[PDB]
Amino acid sequence: AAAANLNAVRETMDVLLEISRILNTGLDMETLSICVRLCEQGINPEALSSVIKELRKATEALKAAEN
Amino acid sequence: MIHELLLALSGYPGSIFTWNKRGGLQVSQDFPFLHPSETSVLNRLCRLGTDYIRFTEFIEQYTGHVGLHGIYLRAFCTGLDSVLQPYRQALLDLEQEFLADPHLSISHINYSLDQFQLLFPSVMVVVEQIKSQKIHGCQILETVYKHSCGGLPPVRSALEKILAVCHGVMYKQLSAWM
């Protein structure tokens, strides 16, 4: 059972990685599972998108200030 | 099903897909559990498999002895085998993909092999022309060039490779003479 679950999760993660790279979403490795694991809780995906956009804006601002 | 189809395209006739000395590979009409459309698509592929079988028999007959005879005929058989090699590789890749995803359909194989449906008929036409006209020596070069003038880019590339190998032999004999 656990072997099947591990296989399934590996293949799902690979599929999601490919989908991300084909869509050129721009997201890095750490949004491997946890971010989507949060979205899988039934969280408002629109708000999740808004907040992640805000975090990206803040991160770019901080990297611009640092640079 | 899928493994036996790949085998038949690989040259191993089965129970559903039988080899006829006259017709080549064909789908058995008696194979149950296939939709008739699936049988039709399979027979469309089996036309390619038939041509492949006939090509392989010809290659073995006219290359394995080192009547028409000659090093140019052997070179032709070697060229045909070298041009069919990519088809074999694509068949192996398709086999791996179908082993990888059990939900893949036979239509996936048919798409992956569609490109060969155009190359193979043209080369079979050229082979049958060479056989029927008993082209010998440099007349093989002439025949290959004339058929190479065809408009099919896949055919053009294949015939260019064959012609280049045969010209390499002709040029080798010329080098020996000169």
Binding site: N5, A8, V9, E11, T12, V15, L16, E18, I19, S20, I22, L23, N24, T25, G26, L27, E30, T31, I34, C35, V36, R37, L38, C39, E40, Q41, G42, I43, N44, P45, E46, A47, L48, S49, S50, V51, I52, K53, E54, L55, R56, A58, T59, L62 | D101, H103
Partner: protein
């Protein structure tokens, strides 16, 4: 483990900062999330996929669109996720266009 802990970890990873160093940002994020916890519209991934395909076509990537359709088929075939609509919407909202100059005609 807890959704708030996961959000904290995500913000830490995004900012490359400690948990305490993002408290104001984390507080804004908490307010944003607590604004809405449930979706306000029905979930049906077919519309999401259609929108994705339309966006790809608008980005002149029809071959990539076919690839996306294939990958969607593969995912739903090996389905282990029950809330795909959400992840698809997230990825759509996070999609960018690196292969073309930024400009889109307004949709209705």
């Amino acid at each position: 483990k807890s959704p708030n802990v996961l959000l904290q970890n995500l913000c830490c990873r995004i900012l490359g900062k400690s948990e305490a160093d993002v408290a104001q940002q984390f507080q804004y994020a908490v307010r944003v999330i607590g604004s809405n916890f449930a979706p306000t519209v029905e979930r049906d991934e077919f519309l999401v996929a259609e929108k994705i395909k339309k966006e790809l076509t608008r980005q002149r990537r029809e071959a990539d669109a076919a690839l996306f359709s294939e990958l969607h088929r593969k995912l739903h075939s090996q389905g282990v996720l029950k809330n795909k609509w959400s992840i698809l919407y997230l990825l759509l909202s996070l999609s960018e266009d690196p292969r073309k100059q930024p400009s889109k005609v307004s949709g209705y």
